[PDB]
Design a protein around this ligand. Structure first.
Ligand SMILES: OC[C@H]1O[C@@H](O)[C@H](O)[C@@H](O)[C@H]1O
Length: 795
């Protein structure tokens, strides 16, 4: 069976995402740019558009990048001041773009060109409007930093902006950035318009020109809260320490903290974004259904301005403080309108199950320790344009607690620390107090022994194929019998990077990594980075898509899912079965370097966007790998850092997005972290990989390590070859080893199995996970000769 991947529709799908994810923050009418106008473009970064951040999720090779000057010219709606372009081009020949010396050594920004009264004054005389581009990038292993040239403007950048401001009376500022930066000094200089354009991949400039020229009306929204100062953020106090960080802010991350305790410290709230038109949000019908555990809220959005556009209806719940304490508001639903013509309107209706605003009782004060619960009291629903400007939509009251789900004491902290508590002063204001987090009392050895899987007796005369499991002819248990201990120790190894069993230049192969495993019709399954498109270290080119933060700012799961439906076909064309994405760690602090390839400070949005990306990839049978599970919110010291975090914060915030990816996204593959969560490495954590992921959420799939990650037993020394610890946790795949069949890493699987410290049943459990995954991949279909063939058209 054969299928066309139309490259022009793929470009157009990516172009729509860029055009729905730019976020307009301020505008006095200077945008959109007027038909026929001539624009002077400032900032040297205009010649080297940041299409992505740095590291594993930003090494997509491409033939050409459409930056902002080029996209504007191709609009045929404005012209660019070409003299000023030549000044930049000629200057850049003496001061070339610094690409850096290696891996995480490419700098945050480039040194800016100093401008003269002369150059700027002359540009003004020959153009109607200035556009100033400020550029920042970031990524793996370098955290962003509160210094000039990083979170702050450099002195020459600030100079550039002041000169431009003085000599032009129409001034637009674009931030070509992976993550948020300081807007204090920008807002003070006071440009006519300010827009965040993120990093849009290889067609960024096409979609950015669309919004700048009014062909598309900006409809993007912030996925984080922009505070006035870095010290205003609740996590800053406890972030950036390479050894250990205490998550004292607990569930009060981002807008959960600011809307609750510190409204005045917010410059732009979560969900904020404007348009070239204006919208009226009118509250509608509200009903609750306590027995179904849902409510239904309606509202109507009307376009009250002079140009067509989209807006986002955002719904929030205020839970009763009760005994646990709650944030003032939590996001539970959102819906972006179609394009609405002036004076037209759309009725928006959402149905919200109660589990979206439940709370996890980790202390037992509700009488339901280790449960998601709805405390007794009044639930108020709000609807609006953002979290601040959201208004009463409905309410209901519960006389008794409702227990939404019975879970267990899992992944609890091994030491005491103080966490934030919402305490209501007698005038009803909420203030920050601190309370002790209770220490874990789980006997981990017993838990592992009590839930030990049953061994399957080996049988080497049974020549059943994995094809026979797929057909239905035999049970998976019947097939797995055939695997020797050599085969079992081999199948839990990933081979890479650049294994010759799969497409050159990809991250790994797994499944059929020996001749003996391949004889069983276990196919070799190919993994490759990354969320923003295929990284091929062979140099082959692929589609470079917008960064994750820009994806999230669309607030539009359908536009994201359409794009990744094309990426689904591109993967099959390149014989890549598993894309290492989405990255979906929470934005705990603005200064985390990898924030660019993650989505939000909110877990509902974070999970909903991840799921959209996955539904895209699943369209033609490809797949994604959710990463990094969990609490990789910091790049500094990430090989050993210890995130010390409560169960409630874990269940409601850090794990919740991943939970949604499993239950709504259909996620079948997860990747663990390089670091520690509550006193041991994630790759060998039983509570994470078996208790929560499998027993509690019902995940049926594979877990894999991060690349060359360390693993340990609790209390023990970390090593890159303790695969027995990994298998005891049901982390199924060590990624990666140069040669798996020869045990190139000298792992301890077999030695620990002879000593009885690893049970055969545990290896067989991993092998059944690997095989059941592998048989539903496109690589299995190739063996069966029933796979999709892809041809590329429009080139
Ligand atoms: O190259 C593959 C891997 O690389 C690691 O360095 C990174 O933390 C992961 O995101 C993973 O994708």
């Amino acid at each position: 069976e054969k299928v066309i991947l139309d490259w022009n529709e793929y470009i157009e799908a990516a172009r729509s995402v860029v055009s729905e994810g730019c976020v307009l923050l301020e505008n006095n009418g200077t945008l959109p740019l007027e038909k026929g106008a001539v624009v002077s473009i400032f900032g040297r970064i205009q010649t080297h558009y940041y299409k992505s951040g740095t590291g594993s999720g930003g090494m997509v090779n491409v033939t050409h990048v459409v930056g902002v000057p080029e996209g504007l010219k191709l609009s045929e709606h404005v012209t660019v001041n070409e003299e000023l372009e030549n000044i930049y081009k000629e200057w850049e020949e003496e001061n070339p773009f610094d690409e850096g010396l290696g891996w995480g050594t490419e700098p945050w920004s480039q040194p800016e060109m100093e401008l003269t009264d002369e150059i700027v004054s002359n540009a003004s005389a020959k153009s109607d409007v200035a556009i100033v581009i400020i550029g920042r990038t970031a990524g793996e292993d370098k955290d962003f930093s509160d210094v000039a040239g990083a979170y702050k403007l450099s002195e020459t950048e600030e100079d550039m902006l002041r000169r431009v401001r003085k000599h032009f009376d129409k001034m637009v500022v674009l931030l070509n950035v992976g993550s948020l930066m300081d807007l204090n000094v920008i807002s003070e200089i006071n440009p006519d318009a300010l827009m965040v354009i993120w990093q849009g991949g290889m067609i960024g400039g096409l979609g950015t020109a669309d919004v700048l020229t009014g062909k598309v009306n900006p409809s993007g929204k912030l996925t984080d809260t922009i505070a006035y100062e870095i010290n205003d953020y609740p996590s800053t106090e406890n972030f950036g320490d390479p050894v250990r960080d205490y998550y004292a802010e607990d569930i009060y991350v981002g807008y959960r903290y600011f809307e609750t305790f510190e409204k005045s410290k917010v410059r732009y709230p979560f969900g904020y974004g404007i348009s070239y038109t204006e919208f009226e949000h009118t509250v509608g019908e509200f009903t609750a259904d306590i027995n179904s555990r849902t409510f239904t809220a309606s509202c109507t959005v009307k376009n009250t301005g002079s140009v067509a556009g989209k807006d986002v209806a955002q719904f929030y719940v205020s839970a009763p403080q009760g005994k646990l304490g709650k944030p003032e508001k939590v996001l539970v639903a959102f819906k972006k309108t179609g394009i609405l013509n002036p004076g037209k309107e759309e009725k928006i209706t959402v149905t919200v199950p109660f589990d979206r605003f439940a709370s996890f009782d980790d202390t037992g004060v509700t009488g339901a320790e280790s449960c998601f619960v709805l405390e007794a009291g009044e639930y108020t629903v709000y609807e609006g344009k953002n979290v601040r400007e959201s208004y009463k939509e409905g309410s209901f009251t519960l006389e008794e607690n409702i227990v939404t789900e019975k879970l267990s004491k899992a992944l609890a902290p091994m030491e005491s620390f103080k966490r934030m508590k919402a305490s209501e002063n007698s005038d009803g204001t909420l203030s920050v107090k601190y309370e002790d987090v209770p220490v874990s009392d789980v006997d981990e050895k017993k838990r592992r022994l009590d839930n030990m899987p049953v061994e399957i007796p080996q049988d080497f005369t049974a020549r059943y194929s994995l094809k026979d499991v797929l057909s239905g002819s035999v049970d998976m248990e019947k097939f797995i019998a055939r695997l020797s201990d050599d085969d079992l120790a081999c199948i839990v190894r990933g081979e890479g990077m650049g294994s010759s069993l799969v497409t050159a230049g990809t991250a790994a192969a797994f499944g059929g990594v020996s001749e003996y495993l391949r004889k069983m019709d276990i196919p070799a399954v190919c993994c490759d980075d990354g969320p923003s498109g295929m990284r091929l270290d062979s140099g082959a080119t692929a589609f470079s898509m917008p960064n994750g933060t820009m994806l999230a700012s669309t607030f539009n799961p359908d536009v994201i899912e359409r794009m990744y439906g094309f990426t689904s076909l591109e993967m099959i064309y390149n014989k890549v079965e598993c894309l290492l994405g989405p990255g979906m760690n929470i934005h705990r602090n603005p200064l985390n370097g990898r924030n660019f390839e993650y989505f939000s400070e909110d877990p509902y949005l974070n999970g909903t966007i991840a799921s959209a990306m996955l539904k895209g990839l699943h369209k033609y049978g490809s797949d994604g790998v959710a990463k990094h599970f969990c609490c990789n919110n910091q790049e500094l010291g990430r090989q050993a850092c210890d995130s010390v975090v409560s169960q409630r914060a874990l269940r409601e915030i850090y794990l919740k997005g991943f939970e949604i990816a499993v239950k709504e996204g259909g996620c079948k593959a997860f990747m663990t972290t390089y670091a520690q969560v509550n006193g041991m490495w994630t790759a060998g954590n039983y509570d994470l990989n078996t208790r929560i992921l499998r027993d509690e959420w019902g995940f049926k799939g594979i877990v894999m390590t991060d690349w060359w990650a360390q693993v340990n037993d609790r209390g023990g020394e970390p090593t890159k070859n303790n695969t027995a610890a990994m298998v005891r946790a049901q982390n199924d795949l060590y990624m990666v080893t140069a040669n798996a069949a020869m045990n190139s890493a000298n792992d301890n699987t077999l030695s620990q199995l002879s000593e009885g410290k690893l049970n055969r049943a545990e290896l067989q459990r991993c092998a059944m996970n690997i095989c059941e995954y592998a048989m539903n991949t496109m690589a299995m279909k190739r063996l069966c000769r029933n796979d999709i063939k892809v041809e590329i058209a429009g080139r």
